[PDB]
Amino acid sequence: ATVCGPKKSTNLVKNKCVNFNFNGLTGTGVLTESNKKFLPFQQFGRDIADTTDAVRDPQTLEILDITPCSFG
Amino acid sequence: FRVQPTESIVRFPNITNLCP
Amino acid sequence: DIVLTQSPASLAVSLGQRATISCRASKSVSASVYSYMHWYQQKPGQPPKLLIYLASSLESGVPARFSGSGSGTDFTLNIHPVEEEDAATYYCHHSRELPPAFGGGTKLEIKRADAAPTVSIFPPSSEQLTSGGASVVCFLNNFYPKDINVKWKIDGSERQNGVLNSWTDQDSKDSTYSMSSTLTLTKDEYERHNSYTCEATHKTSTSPIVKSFNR
Amino acid sequence: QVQLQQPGAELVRPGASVKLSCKASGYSFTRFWMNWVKQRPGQGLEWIGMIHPSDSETRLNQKFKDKATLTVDKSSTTAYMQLSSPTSEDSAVYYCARKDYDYDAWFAYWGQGTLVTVSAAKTTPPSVYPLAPGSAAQTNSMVTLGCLVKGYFPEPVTVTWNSGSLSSGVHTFPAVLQSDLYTLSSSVTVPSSTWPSETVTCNVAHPASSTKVDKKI
C-alpha cells in the first residue's frame, strides 16, 4: 500500500489531533516530539494496551509519539 | 465527548522502483 | 518552557578569521539522536532568512562559508571565510517545547582598515527659506570606526544645541559608515550670520576637516 | 511560487483596534500553521502565537494572553491578528511566517512586514527640499548631492533617486523624532560627467499619505 494517488507526500503537520495513516497503519492521535531511542532496524512500537504508542516516518528518519486525543 | 480530527495525514515511503 | 541565551551580545570579526556564536538553552532539547536548533540571518529592512536547519545540514541557496554543529544545550555557529556581505544580526530558535522562544540576537561587525571621512556641507535651499526657516545639512561618508565627533561653528561660535545625528549600519559591499548632521535655525537667525562651519573629529586625521561657506 | 504579503504600515490611536492582513498564495492555507512574530527595535525578537485555519484553534503566549486575538478567513485564505488597546509599548513590526515541518520545525518564509506606531499626531504631508553646494572648483571627480525630507508622518517613506534608476551611491539615513515629526536625509554620489549633462531627481513616496512628491535639484 505504498502507492495511493496524490497522497504520496502529504507534508507532516504536528501539534494537532489528526487521523493518520503510516505505511498502512490506521490511527488517530496527537503528534509530539519524542525523546525515546529506538533501533533503526525496527518499524514502530506499541504499549501494553496493544495500541501504537509511537511511529517512524518512512521517508526521513525520525521518531514521533502518538498521543491519544482528549476524550470524555 | 470526543474531539474530531479536522485534517488527515497519510504518508507513504518513497518509490525506488515499482512492480510492473 | 525553554529559554535561549546567546553570548557575546555583539561580535567583531575581521576578514579571513572565524566567527563563533553560542546559543545556550535552559534545558536539553536533544531528542532521537537529534537536536532542535535553527539559525537565522536578518538584514535591516529585510525579513530573516533560513541558514542551517538541525545544525547538521546547510540550507539550499546558502553559501558554504557558514557551518555549525553541537550537542546538548550549547551550540556553535561557525563562519569561514568571513566576507563583507556577512554583516548582520543572527538568531537561534528551538521548536522543542511550546511555546517556542527566540534568541537574544548577536550583532556582527566587519573589521577593516581605517578610512578618512568625506565631509560635504550643503547650504540651505531657497525653497525652505520661503517658509521662514533654514536647516544646515552636512554629510559624513565612509568613516571607520563608528565612533566619531561632529561639531558646529557659526561665525566662530559653537552651539551644541539643535543638532540631529543619525548613523547607519555597515554596508554589505563598501563596508563603511555614513551619517549626517542637521542644524536647525530660524529665518531671523539666518540673516544675522554668514559663515557656517561643519567640522568632524576622527582618530586617523590629526587636523579636523573644516568645511564652511559664505552666505 | 509561495509569496507572503502584508501592508506597509498602519496608524492607530490609543484605545482603538487594529487589523492586520496576511495573504497566502501558492499553497494550501488551511493545511499549515500560521505564526506571528513581534519585532521591537532594540528588544530583539518576540513570539506572538499560532492559529490553525481549519478549526480556528489558537495557541497564544501567556504574555499576550487576553490581549492579542487571532482569526482566519477561509474564503479568501487570509489570516488576521487583532490587538486589544494597542499602547506605545505595543508599537513594533509584525510578521506572518509559514511554519514548515520536516522533522524539526523552522520558519521557511516571512512577510514583507507592517510597521505599527501608536501616537496622537495627525497625518502630515512630506516636505522635500533640494541640497546642492551651488558650485565646486576642482573638489573631486565625483558629484555628491543630497535630499532633505522633514515634517512627515508617519514613518517610513520610500526615498529613491530618479525612481530607482541609480543602483549605486544611494545612502538612506534613519529618521529622528523631534516635535512629533520625523526628519531624514539622503545622499547620492554621481560622476562629474553626469550631473552637468544630466539632472538627477529625488523621488519620495509616502503610501500612508497616498501622495508622491517629486522634486528637481
Author numbering:
A (entry chain B): 522 to 593
B (entry chain A): 318 to 337
C (entry chain F): 1 to 215
D (entry chain E): 1 to 217
Can you list sentences taken from the study reporting this PDB entry?
The S protein is a single-span transmembrane protein that protrudes from the surface of SARS-CoV-2 virions to engage the host receptor, human angiotensin-converting enzyme 2 (ACE2). The ectodomain of the S protein consists of a receptor-binding subunit termed S1 and a membrane-fusion subunit termed S2. The S protein of SARS-CoV-2 forms homotrimers on the virion surface and likely exists in two major states, namely the “closed” state with three RBD down (receptor-inaccessible) and the “open” state with one RBD up (receptor-accessible).
We further focused refined the SD1-S3H3 Fab region and obtained a better resolved SD1-S3H3 map, which allowed us to examine the interaction interface between S3H3 Fab and B.1.351 S (Supplementary Figure 10; and Supplementary Figure 11(C, D)). Our structural analysis suggested that the heavy chain of S3H3 Fab contributes more to the interactions with SD1 than the light chain does, i.e. all the three heavy-chain CDRs of S3H3 and its CDRL1 and CDRL3 interact with the SD1. Mutations occurring in the SARS-CoV-2 B.1.1.7, B.1.351, B.1.617.1, and B.1.617.2 variant S proteins relative to the WT S are not present in the S3H3-SD1 interaction interface. Thus, these mutations will not affect S3H3 binding, explaining the observed broad-spectrum SARS-CoV-2 neutralization potency of S3H3 Mab. Indeed, the complete SD1 region (A522 to S591) is nearly identical among the major variants (except B.1.1.7 contains an A570D mutation which is buried in S trimer and hence will not contribute to antibody recognition). The results showed that only MAbs S2G4, S2H5, S4D4, and S5B8 could bind to NTD.
